[PDB]
Design an enzyme around this catalytic site. Structure first.
Site, short mmCIF file in Angstrom:
data_model
loop_
_atom_site.label_atom_id
_atom_site.label_comp_id
_atom_site.label_asym_id
_atom_site.label_seq_id
_atom_site.Cartn_x
_atom_site.Cartn_y
_atom_site.Cartn_z
N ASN A 244 14.12 -5.57 -32.20
CA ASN A 244 15.29 -4.73 -32.00
C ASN A 244 15.40 -3.66 -33.08
N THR B 8 13.28 4.97 -31.77
CA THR B 8 14.22 5.96 -31.23
C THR B 8 14.57 7.02 -32.28
N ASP C 224 23.96 23.42 -28.25
CA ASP C 224 22.96 24.09 -27.41
C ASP C 224 23.53 24.47 -26.04
N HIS D 42 25.96 18.48 -9.51
CA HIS D 42 25.75 17.06 -9.24
C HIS D 42 25.43 16.22 -10.45
N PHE D 43 24.30 16.47 -11.10
CA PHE D 43 23.90 15.47 -12.08
C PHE D 43 24.79 15.55 -13.30
N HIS D 44 25.41 16.70 -13.52
CA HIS D 44 26.39 16.79 -14.58
C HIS D 44 27.66 16.04 -14.21
N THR E 102 13.18 -2.64 -26.23
CA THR E 102 14.59 -3.02 -26.02
C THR E 102 14.78 -3.74 -24.69
N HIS F 63 13.79 8.36 -11.48
CA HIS F 63 14.96 7.88 -10.77
C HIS F 63 15.41 6.46 -11.12
N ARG G 68 24.83 18.02 -31.44
CA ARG G 68 23.77 19.03 -31.51
C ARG G 68 23.47 19.62 -30.13
N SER H 246 30.32 -10.29 -4.84
CA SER H 246 29.94 -9.10 -4.09
C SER H 246 29.52 -7.97 -5.02
N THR I 124 27.11 1.13 -4.27
CA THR I 124 27.94 1.86 -5.22
C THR I 124 29.37 1.99 -4.70
N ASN J 161 23.58 -3.95 -27.41
CA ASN J 161 23.37 -4.56 -28.73
C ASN J 161 24.65 -5.04 -29.39
N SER K 101 12.61 -1.10 -32.52
CA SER K 101 12.92 -0.22 -31.40
C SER K 101 13.95 0.83 -31.78
N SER L 125 33.87 -2.39 -15.13
CA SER L 125 34.38 -3.64 -14.58
C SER L 125 35.12 -4.46 -15.63
N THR M 76 12.10 1.95 -26.23
CA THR M 76 12.93 1.57 -25.09
C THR M 76 12.34 0.38 -24.33
N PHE N 136 17.02 25.02 -23.15
CA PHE N 136 17.37 24.05 -22.11
C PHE N 136 16.40 22.88 -22.01
N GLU O 108 15.47 5.73 -14.18
CA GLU O 108 16.16 6.17 -15.39
C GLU O 108 17.64 6.43 -15.15
N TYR P 211 19.52 4.81 -13.04
CA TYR P 211 20.34 3.62 -12.93
C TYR P 211 20.24 2.77 -14.18
N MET Q 66 23.86 28.22 -24.29
CA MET Q 66 23.36 28.49 -22.94
C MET Q 66 24.43 29.08 -22.04
N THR R 108 16.70 -12.14 -23.94
CA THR R 108 17.95 -12.57 -24.56
C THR R 108 18.97 -13.04 -23.53
N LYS S 216 30.99 -1.27 -5.36
CA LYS S 216 31.47 -1.24 -6.75
C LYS S 216 32.81 -0.54 -6.88
N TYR T 178 22.89 2.81 -33.28
CA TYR T 178 22.42 3.48 -32.05
C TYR T 178 23.48 4.48 -31.60
N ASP U 217 22.37 -14.03 -32.03
CA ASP U 217 21.68 -12.74 -32.15
C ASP U 217 20.78 -12.66 -30.91
C1 HEO Z 1 23.00 8.67 -14.20
C2 HEO Z 1 23.39 9.68 -13.44
C3 HEO Z 1 23.05 9.71 -12.00
C4 HEO Z 1 23.72 8.98 -10.95
C5 HEO Z 1 24.88 8.04 -11.03
C6 HEO Z 1 22.98 9.41 -9.75
C7 HEO Z 1 23.40 8.82 -8.52
C8 HEO Z 1 22.81 9.36 -7.33
N1 HEO Z 1 21.66 10.29 -7.40
FE1 HEO Z 1 21.71 11.92 -8.61
N2 HEO Z 1 21.83 10.33 -9.86
C9 HEO Z 1 22.00 10.50 -11.33
C10 HEO Z 1 21.12 11.29 -12.13
C11 HEO Z 1 20.44 12.32 -11.42
N3 HEO Z 1 20.22 12.27 -9.95
C12 HEO Z 1 19.52 13.57 -9.97
C13 HEO Z 1 18.98 14.17 -8.79
C14 HEO Z 1 19.34 13.54 -7.57
C15 HEO Z 1 18.88 14.22 -6.34
C16 HEO Z 1 18.08 15.50 -6.34
C17 HEO Z 1 18.35 16.48 -5.21
C18 HEO Z 1 17.48 17.68 -5.49
O1 HEO Z 1 16.25 17.50 -5.57
O2 HEO Z 1 18.02 18.80 -5.61
C19 HEO Z 1 19.36 13.34 -5.28
C20 HEO Z 1 19.25 13.45 -3.78
C21 HEO Z 1 20.06 12.27 -6.03
C22 HEO Z 1 20.63 11.21 -5.25
C23 HEO Z 1 21.60 10.42 -5.92
C24 HEO Z 1 22.51 9.61 -5.08
C25 HEO Z 1 22.60 9.55 -3.58
C26 HEO Z 1 23.34 8.90 -6.02
C27 HEO Z 1 24.41 7.94 -5.64
O3 HEO Z 1 24.06 6.64 -6.14
C28 HEO Z 1 25.83 8.26 -6.09
C29 HEO Z 1 26.67 7.11 -5.54
C30 HEO Z 1 28.15 7.35 -5.66
C31 HEO Z 1 28.85 7.74 -4.58
C32 HEO Z 1 28.14 7.95 -3.28
C33 HEO Z 1 30.34 8.01 -4.71
C34 HEO Z 1 31.14 6.71 -4.73
C35 HEO Z 1 31.90 6.60 -3.43
C36 HEO Z 1 31.37 5.92 -2.41
C37 HEO Z 1 30.03 5.28 -2.56
C38 HEO Z 1 32.10 5.79 -1.09
C39 HEO Z 1 31.06 5.64 0.01
C40 HEO Z 1 30.34 6.94 0.28
C41 HEO Z 1 29.14 6.90 0.86
C42 HEO Z 1 28.55 5.57 1.23
C43 HEO Z 1 28.39 8.17 1.14
N4 HEO Z 1 20.05 12.24 -7.51
C44 HEO Z 1 19.23 14.27 -11.24
C45 HEO Z 1 18.49 15.58 -11.36
C46 HEO Z 1 17.49 15.66 -12.50
C47 HEO Z 1 17.04 17.09 -12.60
O4 HEO Z 1 17.70 17.96 -11.99
O5 HEO Z 1 16.03 17.37 -13.27
C48 HEO Z 1 19.87 13.41 -12.23
C49 HEO Z 1 19.97 13.56 -13.73
C1 HEM Z 2 29.89 19.39 -21.75
C2 HEM Z 2 28.67 18.93 -21.54
C3 HEM Z 2 27.55 19.71 -20.98
C4 HEM Z 2 27.36 21.03 -20.65
C5 HEM Z 2 28.34 22.17 -20.78
C6 HEM Z 2 26.04 21.14 -20.16
C7 HEM Z 2 25.51 22.36 -19.72
C8 HEM Z 2 24.23 22.46 -19.22
C9 HEM Z 2 23.65 23.64 -18.73
C10 HEM Z 2 24.33 24.98 -18.68
C11 HEM Z 2 22.39 23.35 -18.31
C12 HEM Z 2 21.41 24.32 -17.72
C13 HEM Z 2 21.74 24.56 -16.25
C14 HEM Z 2 20.95 25.72 -15.71
O1 HEM Z 2 19.75 25.55 -15.47
O2 HEM Z 2 21.47 26.83 -15.51
C15 HEM Z 2 22.18 21.98 -18.55
C16 HEM Z 2 21.02 21.32 -18.24
C17 HEM Z 2 20.92 19.94 -18.39
N1 HEM Z 2 21.79 19.07 -18.90
FE1 HEM Z 2 23.48 19.53 -19.53
N2 HEM Z 2 25.44 19.95 -20.18
C18 HEM Z 2 26.30 19.05 -20.66
C19 HEM Z 2 26.18 17.70 -20.87
C20 HEM Z 2 25.06 17.01 -20.50
C21 HEM Z 2 24.93 15.65 -20.65
C22 HEM Z 2 25.96 14.72 -21.21
C23 HEM Z 2 23.68 15.30 -20.20
C24 HEM Z 2 23.26 13.89 -20.24
C25 HEM Z 2 22.14 13.42 -19.73
C26 HEM Z 2 23.04 16.51 -19.77
C27 HEM Z 2 21.79 16.63 -19.24
C28 HEM Z 2 21.26 17.85 -18.84
C29 HEM Z 2 19.92 17.94 -18.25
C30 HEM Z 2 18.97 16.81 -18.00
C31 HEM Z 2 19.72 19.23 -17.98
C32 HEM Z 2 18.51 19.87 -17.35
C33 HEM Z 2 17.55 20.34 -18.43
C34 HEM Z 2 16.58 21.32 -17.84
O3 HEM Z 2 16.97 22.25 -17.11
O4 HEM Z 2 15.37 21.21 -18.08
N3 HEM Z 2 23.91 17.54 -19.98
N4 HEM Z 2 23.31 21.46 -19.11
CU LIG Z 3 17.38 11.18 -8.20
#
Ligand code: HEO
Ligand code: HEM
Ligand SMILES: [Cu+2]
Ligand SMILES: CCCCCCCC/C=C/CCCCCCCC(=O)O[C@@H](COC(=O)CCCCCCCCCCCCCCC)COP(=O)([O-])OCC[N+](C)(C)C
Ligand SMILES: CCCCCCCC/C=C/CCCCCCCC(=O)O[C@@H](COC(=O)CCCCCCCCCCCCCCC)COP(=O)([O-])OCC[N+](C)(C)C
Ligand SMILES: CCCCCCCC/C=C\CCCCCCCC(=O)O[C@@H](COC(=O)CCCCCCCCCCCCCCC)COP(=O)([O-])OCC[N+](C)(C)C
Ligand SMILES: CCCCCCCCCCCCCCCCCC(=O)OC[C@H](COP(=O)(O)OCCN)OC(=O)CCCCCCCCCCCCCCCCC
Ligand SMILES: CCCCCCCCCCCCCCCCCC(=O)OC[C@H](COP(=O)(O)OCCN)OC(=O)CCCCCCCCCCCCCCCCC
EC number: 7.1.1.3
Lengths: 263, 99, 661, 204
Positions: free
Chosen positions: C142, C149, C75, C419-421, C204, C284, C71, C315, C359, C124, C145, C299, C201, C103, C286, C288, C79, C211, C362, C61, C135
């Site tokens: 397994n 993938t 890409d 953010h999500f990056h 799995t 969403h 790959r 806790s 979080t 796994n 699955s 941890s 998935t 993209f 996905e 977590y 971009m 398990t 944590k 995996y 196992d």
């Molecule tokens: C696996 C990765 C991952 C993780 C960990 C998270 C964690 C969170 N997600 Fe980010 N999400 C993730 C993956 C995404 N979420 C997304 C989009 C997204 C959006 C979209 C906003 C928009 O539409 O433009 C919101 C509001 C959030 C909320 C959050 C929040 C509040 C957390 C929180 O759980 C983070 C918690 C951590 C914190 C807060 C820092 C730790 C410090 C703390 C906790 C001290 C205490 C602070 C406070 C209590 C505030 N997620 C997208 C967009 C997909 C797309 O664009 O197509 C992806 C991929």
């Molecule tokens: C060095 C690592 C990475 C770089 C430089 C990178 C760069 C980018 C860029 C430039 C975009 C397009 C943003 C735009 O719209 O302008 C993008 C989209 C995205 N990336 Fe990445 N990325 C990286 C790693 C990752 C990883 C590890 C994930 C894992 C889940 C990821 C998930 C995504 C997703 C979901 C999108 C949105 C796709 C879409 O627009 O439809 N990226 N990334």
């Molecule tokens: Cu979200």
């Protein structure tokens, strides 16, 4: 920060309110995030393996006061940020009209394939990729799409709203300052999404806005019926500003009724 | 042998009743729509519980309580997903009409 | 069967002279390939592809995750260089009909075939070892699955090689994805890759839930399990409860595109907003699914490399379960800008902050684990501190995104991108490299090279920051996602800085590859010879390195949280029992490969509208399933003589190290 | 209820004393059925959202023949109770009552599927297929997904009947009949939700 960007330096009341809540939320989160990062680097360095003169209690794994504090401070920051979230989400709702003594200017927004189409009903004109309105005047956008989902967005002025076909969203904006603001689609719509991009002109006064309307009435082309609409709604890219002097009086309703057609 | 024949037959008779009565209340329109609709949803819910108790042999200790739990968590997810999806979509559909 | 002889082909290479490296050193990783290692070597079919052993399936995996990471990172470089050139006033090397495909494909490849397999392969590897199981509950499932993938990976690679993938963004929002505005076959490639990988998935998730609940060692209660086990349990709960939503939603898109139906088709009573609602109701949890087992790895790594018991176990476990239930009432935050008016938006904003609370529990638990302790700065330890800093930054930016007023200007900008990056790269990817470094000796019997791992970490964290702080700035400047052509010049310099950041991450990925190569050429000078190289507290380190294929000849009895540490404290670790009973074990089956190959046939014929052949493929899956159900010799017993040999070799190495009781 | 540090054997409660059990597979099928509950719930929410999407065509009241749905419901309920009688045979051993009760169950299930196929064909022929409206699309999706599940249960039942006829009531066939018992009874539960939400409310 101190950027001159469209969000940290907005020119509309809605954008200023959103900047205020961004800064307030950002600071409230710094209260809990900055000690976390500082203790990350400080606890990493201070309790080295090589550091002889540290305490090293390896079996201490639970406390009541530490556990209570690290529960407590996220709770309180989230309560304050949640209260502010409630008040500001009800205050800055896009469908809610703005409290203003001036009557609003209604602009009708249709997302064509890769262009922005605008209708002024009470002025009876149409534009592509350009709007104008007087400054310090509330503006009521009635937004729909023609093909696929877009997102009408003037970032300097205020909020996004989605543009979806067969259904009507609505946005309320105002410009606190005359100028020219870039607007975009903020939801990807296909090969041409990079081009669909317009200008909003906040004229300093009503007389300059009426002059822009009077310039639009001199256009030879008219949006008289649906045939001219589907001629303009053919897919194209990067299209220039053009005007239309005669508009079918309920074109927006007709475009939405294309998709609510029954039989 | 968790199920007896008598347990299955009482579940069978209860299921026949909880099927024939809502069908009769809908095909004749005897009550008004409200006390038809609430009646058919209530009888559907209790018929689902009768099928779970009688045909599935479902109980709080079957696999260390993990069946019941899995099911209660699953019903919580169904409640959130379906009820929330209806609520979101109704609010959206209200906010998309040509006001 | 009997002569597969199957390999893959090189995707592409582009010359770009932008800053003379993006397009040249992008080629320096594009040319990373290898010659045949004798495709269908009879060793490779018997011991790896048909293997129902969880350790090998986990390794495989991860191999898939690393290859797809290479790959999709290529890409991402193309971009980023295209965005840098298009903001300088030139038509770049990527037209929109290629960039949009890139993209969409890249986000799909990243999320599914990089982020999913790495975390699933880690479970796994070490979950049955952590719970003292020989196992998983369903070994053939397994293997099946895994191969589903692989089928999804194959579909996306063929679509990208041909040049026909979806052009809609990685989630295929509905009107655009509709057969009307996307008549081509790329959305079908997207559809069938996510269907087959989602079936894998879901299998799995079911397999690990059963398990973890049914097959842990006697004496291991629920609150004596390791933290990574709790996190794996919770993420598998989320997998089970969320991937049916993805299955139904993409099946409804399938019915819209194949049968002409009207679920989301904008004109005949359809509602595209129902797809967006359902796709984020899947998407969403996905999040977590990705971030929970990673939290478990962090941890474990903090506990073992602080030389100190983990702070506040109960806790942090309740924080994991709190995240696990809460992840299901927050999904509207992806569409605040759609137009639910302020009540629903307020509700979902509040619940997203309720996500943000445990979080933080944590995070501060991991801090106070480090509050005492001889902290040795291993590679995995550096990954852990870099995760804490990076994920704190990303989490506060997401809680900023959680406010609907803030989201009305920040939705679909590069602030959301950053953010999500931030959270994915920091949390998920740092947890990936931390877990791989942590469990490489348990995977193979030797340690990874340390200094190259440090270099890879430093390039990863610094290049991430240089790559994605300008996207925060750019989102504040009003630049939206998925922009490709004639980008406004005020963005340019920030984009240029982000370009440099991508380059730095390339070096780290290069360093990673170099690390692996160095670690393989120096196997003999870096093996550990016990199962306990770092110290260690959970009973996967009570085995040898690599484990025997049967995984604890004698199933341990636990008595206590962190069982291996409390057997090393009071000295009854490394105890040789007198007699070994027989060990029951399933056999390697090729039937997962055959069902996978029939699914490949069915998916390809369904994409190219063959209609027949799709029937043959579907029937091949059903008949292979039934014929496999007719087989009876599905298991075998390993004799005591082979158990004595391996366990004696283990105890010879233990007494050569110097531990007896 | 006690903590025994000294009981170091593999002693477990009796239940014919094998301790290589099929209860793990029953629990796994139960968890899969909860996932498939969530699958059907997403289809139900889609139908609830799209039910008024009768674009210019028929509504639920215009379409649903309640007596025919009543015969469908009776057929599938009879299938559930006859499979329940099949599980009373096994547990009393005595095969060829298992085969007879599963055969009657299979005929009842093939009755339910055949009248569903009759309604689907009658709708598609009269220009009222899933491509006509969003309501018809959601109706076809929900009902046909239940029908595909019942169909897959029918193939599984026939294959299992063949395996019982060949190898007898083995320990493998124990866990297989119990897994299919879970699947079939759950399918009758899903159909109860189906005729309540779709048919009875639709023909109100
Ligand atoms: C696996 C990765 C991952 C993780 C960990 C998270 C964690 C969170 N997600 Fe980010 N999400 C993730 C993956 C995404 N979420 C997304 C989009 C997204 C959006 C979209 C906003 C928009 O539409 O433009 C919101 C509001 C959030 C909320 C959050 C929040 C509040 C957390 C929180 O759980 C983070 C918690 C951590 C914190 C807060 C820092 C730790 C410090 C703390 C906790 C001290 C205490 C602070 C406070 C209590 C505030 N997620 C997208 C967009 C997909 C797309 O664009 O197509 C992806 C991929
Ligand atoms: C060095 C690592 C990475 C770089 C430089 C990178 C760069 C980018 C860029 C430039 C975009 C397009 C943003 C735009 O719209 O302008 C993008 C989209 C995205 N990336 Fe990445 N990325 C990286 C790693 C990752 C990883 C590890 C994930 C894992 C889940 C990821 C998930 C995504 C997703 C979901 C999108 C949105 C796709 C879409 O627009 O439809 N990226 N990334
Ligand atoms: Cu979200
Ligand atoms: C194929 C198309 C379809 C797609 C299928 C996809 C799956 C395909 C799966 C294929 C799996 C098979 C290949 C790897 C097997 C290694 C073990 C082994 O067999 O023992 C070997 C002894 O040891 C060695 O010689 C090397 C041991 C470590 C190698 C690690 C490689 C992967 C690293 C990445 C991260 C791993 C995870 C890390 C997780 C923490 C025997 O020697 P050998 O293996 O014959 O020689 C290997 C060549 N080498 C010496 C140059 C290395
Ligand atoms: C909106 C979207 C809708 C999507 C869903 C649509 C419906 C999806 C419906 C899914 C339900 C079916 C799944 C359960 C089957 C049994 C599994 C099981 O636990 O095995 C038990 C017995 O099983 C057997 O004896 C083998 C199964 C018989 C063949 C099943 C054919 C199904 C055909 C249709 C397939 C799906 C068609 C999908 C078409 C789209 C116990 O197993 P065991 O004793 O350990 O040994 C078994 C042997 N084995 C190891 C080889 C298994
Ligand atoms: C959806 C259906 C989903 C399948 C649901 C299976 C539930 C299994 C429950 C657990 C169980 O008893 O597992 C045991 C038996 O079970 C199996 O081995 C099942 C094998 C399923 C193969 C399905 C492949 C085709 C998918 C159909 C759709 C493809 C096309 C879609 C378009 C595990 O056995 P073992 O111990 O590993 O030996
Ligand atoms: C999840 C899986 C289900 C997704 C939806 C699949 C819908 C089937 C599409 C059929 C397309 C079509 O028009 O087929 C024409 C063909 C003659 O019709 C035929 O007779 C062949 C149809 C084959 C469909 C595949 C069968 C397995 C599913
Ligand atoms: C998720 C599940 C969603 C299911 C949606 C099904 C949609 C079917 C779309 C059909 C498109 C038009 C096909 C057509 O016109 O073909 C008519 C033809 C009737 O003639 P013939 O082939 O002799 O029928 C044999 C079976 N009656 O053959 C037919 O198509 C008639 C049979 C209709 C379908 C019956 C089975 C549906 C699934 C049951 C479970």
């Amino acid at each position: 920060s101190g950027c001159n960007s469209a969000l940290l330096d907005p020119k509309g009341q809605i954008g200023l309110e959103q900047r205020s809540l961004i800064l307030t939320a950002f600071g409230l989160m710094l209260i809990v995030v900055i000690p976390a990062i500082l203790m990350a680097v400080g606890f990493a360095w201070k309790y080295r393996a090589s550091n002889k003169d540290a305490k090293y209690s390896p079996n201490w794994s639970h406390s009541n006061k530490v556990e209570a504090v690290v529960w407590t401070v996220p709770i309180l920051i989230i309560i304050f940020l949640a209260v502010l979230t409630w008040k500001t989400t009800h205050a800055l709702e896009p469908s809610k009209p703005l409290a203003h003594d001036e009557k609003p200017i209604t602009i009708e927004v249709v997302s064509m394939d890769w262009k922005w189409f605008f209708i002024y009903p009470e002025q009876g004109i149409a534009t592509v990729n350009e709007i104008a309105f007087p400054a310090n005047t509330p503006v009521y956008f009635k937004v729909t799409s023609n093909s696929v989902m877009n997102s009408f967005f003037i970032p300097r002025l205020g909020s996004q709203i989605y543009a979806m076909a067969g259904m009507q969203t609505r946005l309320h904006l105002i410009a606190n300052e005359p100028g020219t603001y870039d607007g975009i689609s903020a939801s990807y719509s296909g090969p041409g999404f990079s081009g669909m991009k317009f200008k909003a002109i906040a004229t300093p006064d009503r007389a300059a806005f009426d002059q822009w309307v009077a310039k639009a009435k001199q256009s030879p082309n008219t949006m008289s019926d649906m045939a001219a609409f589907e001629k303009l709604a053919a897919p194209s890219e990067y299209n220039q500003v053009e005007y239309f002097s005669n508009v079918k009086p309920d074109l927006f309703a007709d475009v939405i009724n294309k998709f609510m057609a029954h039989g | 042998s968790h199920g007896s024949v008598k347990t299955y037959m009482t579940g069978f008779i209860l299921s026949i009743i909880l099927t024939v009565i809502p069908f009769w209340m809908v095909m004749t329109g005897a009550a008004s729509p409200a006390v038809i609709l609430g009646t058919i949803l209530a009888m559907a819910v209790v018929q689902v519980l009768v099928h779970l108790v009688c045909f599935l042999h479902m109980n709080t200790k079957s696999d260390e309580g993990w069946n019941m739990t899995a099911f209660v968590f699953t019903v919580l997810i169904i409640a959130i997903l379906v009820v929330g999806s209806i609520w979101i979509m109704w609010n959206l559909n209200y906010n998309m009409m040509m006001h | 069967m009997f002569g597969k002889l199957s390999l893959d082909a090189v995707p592409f290479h582009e010359p770009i002279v932008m800053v003379t490296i993006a397009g040249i050193i992008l080629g320096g990783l594009a040319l990373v390939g290898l010659i045949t290692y004798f495709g269908k070597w009879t060793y490779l079919w018997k011991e790896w592809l048909t293997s129902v052993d969880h350790k090998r399936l986990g390794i495989m995996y991860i191999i898939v995750a690393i290859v797809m990471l290479l790959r999709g990172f290529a890409d991402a470089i193309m971009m980023r260089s295209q965005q840098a050139l298009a903001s300088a006033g030139e038509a770049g090397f990527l037209p929109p009909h290629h960039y949009d495909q890139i993209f969409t494909a890249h986000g799909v490849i990243m999320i599914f075939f990089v982020a999913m397999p790495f975390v699933i392969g880690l479970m796994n590897l070490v979950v049955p070892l952590q719970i003292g199981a020989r196992d998983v509950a369903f070994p053939f499932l397994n293997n099946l699955s895994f191969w589903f993938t692989v089928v999804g990976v194959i579909l996306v690679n063929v679509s990208l090689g041909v040049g026909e993938f979806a052009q809609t963004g990685w989630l295929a929002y509905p009107p655009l994805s509709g057969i009307e505005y996307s008549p081509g076959v790329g959305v079908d490639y997207w559809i069938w890759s996510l269907q087959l990988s989602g079936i894998g998935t879901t299998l799995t998730g079911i397999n690990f839930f059963v398990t973890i609940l049914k097959m842990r060692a006697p004496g291991m209660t629920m609150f004596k399990m390791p933290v990574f086990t709790w996190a794996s349990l919770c993420a598998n709960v989320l997998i089970i409860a969320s991937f049916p939503i993805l299955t139904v939603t993409v099946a409804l898109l399938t019915l819209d595109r194949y049968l002409g139906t009207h679920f989301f088709t904008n004109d005949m009573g359809g509602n595209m907003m129902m797809y967006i609602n359902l796709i984020w109701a899947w998407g969403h949890p996905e999040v977590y699914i990705l971030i929970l087992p990673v939290f478990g790895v962090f941890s474990e790594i903090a506990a073992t490399f602080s030389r100190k018991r983990l702070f506040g176990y109960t806790s942090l476990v309740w924080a994991t379960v709190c995240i696990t239930v809460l992840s299901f009432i927050v999904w509207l935050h992806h569409f605040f800008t759609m137009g639910a008016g302020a009540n629903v938006n307020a509700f979902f904003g509040i619940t997203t902050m309720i996500i943000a609370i445990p979080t933080g529990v944590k995070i501060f638990n991991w801090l106070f684990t480090m509050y005492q302790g001889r902290i040795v700065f291993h590679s995995a330890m550096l990954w852990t501190i870099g995760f804490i800093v990076t994920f704190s930054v990303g989490g506060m930016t997401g809680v900023l995104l959680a406010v609907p007023g803030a989201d009305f200007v920040l939705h679909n900008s590069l602030f959301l991108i950053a953010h999500f990056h931030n959270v994915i790269i920091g949390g998920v990817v740092f947890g990936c490299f931390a877990g791989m470094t942590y469990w490489w000796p348990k995977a193979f019997g030797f340690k990874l090279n340390e200094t190259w791992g440090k270099r890879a970490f430093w390039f990863w964290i610094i290049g991430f920051f240089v790559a994605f702080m300008p996207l925060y700035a750019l989102g504040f400047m009003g630049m939206t996602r998925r922009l490709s052509q004639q980008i406004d010049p005020q963005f340019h310099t920030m984009l240029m800085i982000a370009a440099s950041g991508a380059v730095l991450i390339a070096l780290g990925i290069l360093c990673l590859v170099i690390q692996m190569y160095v670690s393989i050429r120096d196997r003999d000078q870096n093996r550990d010879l016990t199962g306990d190289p770092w110290g260690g507290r959970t009973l996967e380190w009570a085995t040898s390195s690599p484990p025997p294929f049967y995984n604890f000849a004698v199933v341990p009895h636990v008595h206590e949280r962190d069982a291996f540490w409390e057997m090393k404290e009071k000295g009854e670790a490394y105890k040789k029992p007198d007699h070994y009973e027989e060990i029951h074990m399933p056999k390697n089956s090729g039937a997962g490969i055959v069902i996978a190959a029939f699914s490949t046939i069915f998916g390809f014929a369904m994409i190219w509208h063959i209609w027949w052949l799709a029937i043959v493929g579907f029937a091949g899956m059903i008949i292979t399933w039934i014929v496999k159900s007719f087989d009876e010799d599905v298991d075998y017993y390993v004799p005591v003589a082979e158990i004595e040999k391996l366990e004696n070799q283990h105890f010879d190495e233990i007494t050569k190290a110097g531990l007896k009781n | 209820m006690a903590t025994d540090t000294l009981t170091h054997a593999t002693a477990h409660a009796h239940e014919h004393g094998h301790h290589d059990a099929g209860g793990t597979k029953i629990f796994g099928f139960w968890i899969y059925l909860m996932s498939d509950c969530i699958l059907f719930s997403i289809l139900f929410a889609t139908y609830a959202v799209l039910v008024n999407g009768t674009a210019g065509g028929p509504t639920g009241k215009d379409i649903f023949e309640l007596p025919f749905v009543l015969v469908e419901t009776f057929l599938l309920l009879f299938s559930s109770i006859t499979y329940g009688m099949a599980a009373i045979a096994m547990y009393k051993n005595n095969k060829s009552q298992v085969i007879s009760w599963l055969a009657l169950t299979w005929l009842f299930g093939a009755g339910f599927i055949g009248m569903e196929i009759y309604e689907f064909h009658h709708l598609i022929v009269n220009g009222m297929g899933p491509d006509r409206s969003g309501f018809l699309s959601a109706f076809f999706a929900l009902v046909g997904t239940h029908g595909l599940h019942v169909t897959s249960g029918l193939i599984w039942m026939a294959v299992l009947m063949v395996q019982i006829a060949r190898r007898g009531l083995t320990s493998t066939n124990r866990t297989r009949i119990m897994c299919l018992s879970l699947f079939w009874h759950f399918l009758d539960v899903v159909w109860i939700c189906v005729f309540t939400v779709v048919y009875l409310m639709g023909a109100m």
